[PDB]
Amino acid sequence: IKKKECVYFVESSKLSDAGKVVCQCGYTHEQHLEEATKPHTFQGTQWDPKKHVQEMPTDAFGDIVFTGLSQKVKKYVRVSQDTPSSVIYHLMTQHWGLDVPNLLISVTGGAKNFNMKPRLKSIFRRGLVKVAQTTGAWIITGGSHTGVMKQVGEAVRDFSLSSSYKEGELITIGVATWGTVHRREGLIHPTGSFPAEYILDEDGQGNLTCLDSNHSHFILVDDGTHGQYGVEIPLRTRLEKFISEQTKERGGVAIKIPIVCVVLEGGPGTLHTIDNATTNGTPCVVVEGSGRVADVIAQVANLPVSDITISLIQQKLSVFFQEMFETFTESRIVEWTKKIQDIVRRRQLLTVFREGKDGQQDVDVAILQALLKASRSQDHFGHENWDHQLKLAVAWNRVDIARSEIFMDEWQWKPSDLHPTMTAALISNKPEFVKLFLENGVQLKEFVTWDTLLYLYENLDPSCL
Amino acid sequence: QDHFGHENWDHQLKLAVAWNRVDIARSEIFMDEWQWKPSDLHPTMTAALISNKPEFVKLFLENGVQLKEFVTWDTLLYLYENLDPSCL
Amino acid sequence: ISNKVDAMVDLLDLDGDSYHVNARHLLYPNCPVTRFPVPNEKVPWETEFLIYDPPFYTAERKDAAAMDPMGDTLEPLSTIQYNVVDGLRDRRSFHGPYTVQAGLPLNPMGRTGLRGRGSLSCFGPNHTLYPMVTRWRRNEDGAICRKSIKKMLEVLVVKLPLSEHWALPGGSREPGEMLPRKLKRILRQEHWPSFENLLKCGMEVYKGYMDDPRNTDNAWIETVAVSVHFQDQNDVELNRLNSNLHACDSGASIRWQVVDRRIPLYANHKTLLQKAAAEFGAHY
Amino acid sequence: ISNKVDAMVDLLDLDGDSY
């Protein structure tokens, strides 16, 4: 059942608390999500996690279709903040029927809505499908119905109902806050499983944000709270440091799973999010033209270390939140200066998607230049880089990216080196790589050893006759 | 000029039936933030079925007008009263 | 292929201004007269010469310069002084340089090229009020405006059945009575004579001048804006404003309406509404 | 021919620090 591992994070918030800003009661008093400590416990003077917040078996372990927006199914699991990352990864693969992915896309940006040029919409919403169609990726997003996480849900809807193909079922995993959700009620079931429903409502539920419709899987984290937005940041970066840590298994000799961000809008906190990714050594891409902080880092992308003390480029955010250079209500702009000056220093781990001279290349290739650009920056002790990028290049099924990038430098010939990769494309099939390696002098009269066939016949197609 | 809510994205689509200009319905009044509420497309889905105008029906089926929910009992009673009068 | 090369035939062929607007229109809603166009550089008559003149037509209904149902005199009948409260014709303005230069009170917001009409029924400011009845609105249990970040507002506006907009009571000095009694220009058709402290629980928003279409050079409508807010959504304060609504002898409807930049009142309240919306951080 | 005119749709859319 796998219910006895994901646990609650529940406790009263109205032991005693004068948070009377919400007028309905003092601060979510009883007959609420607060249900357990309604009798008298010891003191309850301060609820803070010294005052314990329980972990009991869960009540949202099901599957709900959006009524009446769509028809497909999607999985509903709430989870505590202290849940180990290997538990949820076992929950995704072995119990939701999810394949071990080949890359991670962590789209971040601003929570507020935004509208850009429709050329950028026709490029970004098209190519982001064309990533996860070919690779079989996961798209870690931010959950709810507003902002950059709304725009990625547009792109899946722009594919999976128009060219609604089972071949290449995209997997977009929404990580949000059980507590910023708009209808926490109507979704609880200590029974354990439910093919239930709820109804989307956008214009109501003023503070509690509603879930986005177009997502494949939902993961909700909590601290027994409500209204407080950012609580999934110490989960998503703790989760993605494990999925990037976990390896593939496949018969062609396996890889480490790479990881990439995409930033669209940005803003405060997102600038803290980007360099926190690049310090851990995960590259990511900034789009041009749209974005509060995104067009800033697009502008200071190619300039060297010669800093404005940003005040010329303070108000390049086209919305003018706080409306002025001087009335920005952010003292010590020197704080954001260091965050930019660390990002632009790491030239390898940051690329920028220029609209005019890179969009005709693709946004597919630019988002896959960047993973190849990072792994080119980090090899150890010899020609493992042109072994590691090709190890990735099997699992992309992107033959031109294997051709146009890692077959145009000085390839160290040594055609025994292609033998752990020639074995990959034969089992995986993937037939188009074999013509690429036969172009590069992988002589079949030398390659087929006795022991290779013994490894080959142990890896037949299991469904075959 | 609309008044009191989302009548604008009801009024422009009401025009958009009578244009038979499918791309102008697509490229203009399906690129903003469409307030979903797919009961709202029911007085317009009824239009393209009687008028025929078949090309709008693929546009609304793209926008999640679920046929298993749309076809009420009273809609067919309104539908069969509006047949093609020259038909057999 | 044939549809795609057609996409390439068409692909390679590519080688003070804010003084008046509504008062400066042509038609004025009763008699077909328009005689002076003034643009955004000749509006303040104190600045430029404007040797060309608008001919005059006054009092709009009954008696051109006599105005015995209206209540003002002739220019040969020794026009009453500029900033005097006396008498029952309240000529006490809010701005200082209320100018009676030509023997008649010329307006201070620049020349609109008009007559001296008694569309105001008064050769003066006609200091009016607008009870901005304000529901900081709700949902099933209390809402905000999720559209930007702000707060969404609800305002009672009455659709009068003849004129095609949705308005508020114009407290424009009920003849013989004061300003809280042309507050009851329409509010007498809301049936209560009991509660009379409506603006006593009011909060001032904006004192000044409106772009009324029925203005002229000698009659123009400046005003005071007064808010009556409601933060409870809950109890007797909204209830005494709602349970005292029989509206028994009313024309069409008085329904609660949300606010935006797209409400059906045309010009006067709509340019006034955002100043009420600015005070409480509303969406407009 | 059909693969080559598709190559022309996309072809014409182009108009101390060390401390």
Among chain B residues, CA nearest to A113: B33
User: A-chain residues within 8 Å CB-CB of C232?
Assistant: 23
How far, in Å, CA of A284 to CA of A368, rounded?
Answer: 10
User: B-chain residues within 8 Å CB-CB of C156?
Assistant: none
Q: Which of D1, D2, D8 is the closest to C8 by Cβ?
A: D8
Q: Is C68 on the interface with A (CB under 8 A)?
A: no
How far, in Å, CA of A310 to CA of A325, rounded?
Answer: 10
Residue A270 labeled ligand binder: yes
Contact: B69, A69; criterion CB under 8 Å: no
The chains in contact with chain A, meaning 3 or more Cβ pairs closer than 8 Å, are: B, C, D
Chain interruptions in chain D, by residue before each (C–N > 2.5 Å):
15
Cα dihedral across residues A457, A458, A461, A462: positive or negative: positive
Q: Which residues 6+ apart lie within 8 Å of A139 measured at CB?
A: A105, A107, A128, A132, A152, A170, A171, A172, A173
- Method of structure determination: cryo-EM
For chains A and D, count residue pairs whose Cβ atoms are closer than 8 Å. 6
Please, do chains D and B touch (3+ CB pairs < 8 Å)? no
Q: In angstroms, how far is the first alpha carbon of chain A from the final one?
A: 34
Contact: A204, C149; criterion CB under 8 Å: no
Task: Look at residue B43 and give its three-state secondary structure.
Answer: helix
Cβ pair A156, A122 in contact under 8 A: no
Cα dihedral across residues B13, B18, B24, B25: positive or negative: positive
- A 10 A CB-CB count for A221 gives 25
| Distances from the Cα of C67 to the Cα of A117, A287, C61, C79, C119, angstroms | 60, 69, 9, 13, 11
Contact: B69, A71; criterion CB under 8 Å: no
Residue A236 labeled ligand binder: yes
- A 10 A CB-CB count for C25 gives 14
How far, in Å, CA of B78 to CA of A266, rounded?
Answer: 50
Contact: A162, B62; criterion CB under 8 Å: yes
Cβ pair A365, A335 in contact under 8 A: no
Dig out the tokens for B87 from the structure.
Answer: 């038909």
Please, do chains D and A touch (3+ CB pairs < 8 Å)? yes
Residue A207 labeled ligand binder: no
Q: Which of C4, C12, C14 is the closest to D5 by Cβ?
A: C4
Q: Which of A23, A146, A206 is the closest to C139 by Cβ?
A: A206
User: B-chain residues within 8 Å CB-CB of C263?
Assistant: 3-4
Task: Look at residue C111 and give its three-state secondary structure.
Answer: coil
Q: Look at strands C256-258 and C153-156 and give their pairing.
A: antiparallel
User: C-chain residues within 8 Å CB-CB of A112?
Assistant: 148-149
User: C-chain residues within 8 Å CB-CB of B3?
Assistant: 262-264
Residue C214 labeled ligand binder: yes
Q: Which of B1, B2, B4 is the closest to C257 by Cβ?
A: B4
Instruction: Count Cβ neighbours within 10 Å for each residue of A49-87 and write b for 16 or more, e otherwise.
Output: eebebebeebbbbbbbebebbbeeebbbbbbbbebebee
Q: Look at strands A61-63 and A65-67 and give their pairing.
A: unpaired
Q: Is C257 on the interface with B (CB under 8 A)?
A: yes
Q: What is the DSSP letter of C79?
A: P
Reported resolution, Å:
3.6
Contact: C263, B2; criterion CB under 8 Å: no
Provide the Cα torsion C263, C170, C210, C75; round to 10°.
150
Residues of D with CB under 8 A from a CB of C: 1-2, 5-6, 8-9, 12, 15
How far, in Å, CA of C83 to CA of A208, rounded?
Answer: 55
Q: Is D10 on the interface with A (CB under 8 A)?
A: yes
Residue C28 labeled ligand binder: no
Please, do chains C and B touch (3+ CB pairs < 8 Å)? yes
Provide the Cα torsion A12, A15, A17, A23; round to 10°.
60
Question: Angle A233-243/A85-96 helices, nearest 10 degrees?
Answer: 70
State the residue for tokens 């917001």. Answer: C109
The chains in contact with chain C, meaning 3 or more Cβ pairs closer than 8 Å, are: A, B, D
User: Which residue, among A429, A436, A435, A437, has the nearest Cα to A456 in the 3D structure?
Assistant: A429
User: B-chain residues within 8 Å CB-CB of C257?
Assistant: 4
Q: Which residues 6+ apart lie within 8 Å of D6 measured at CB?
A: C4
Residue A97 backbone zone (phi > 0: left; psi -120 to 50: alpha; other: beta): left
Cβ pair A337, A310 in contact under 8 A: yes
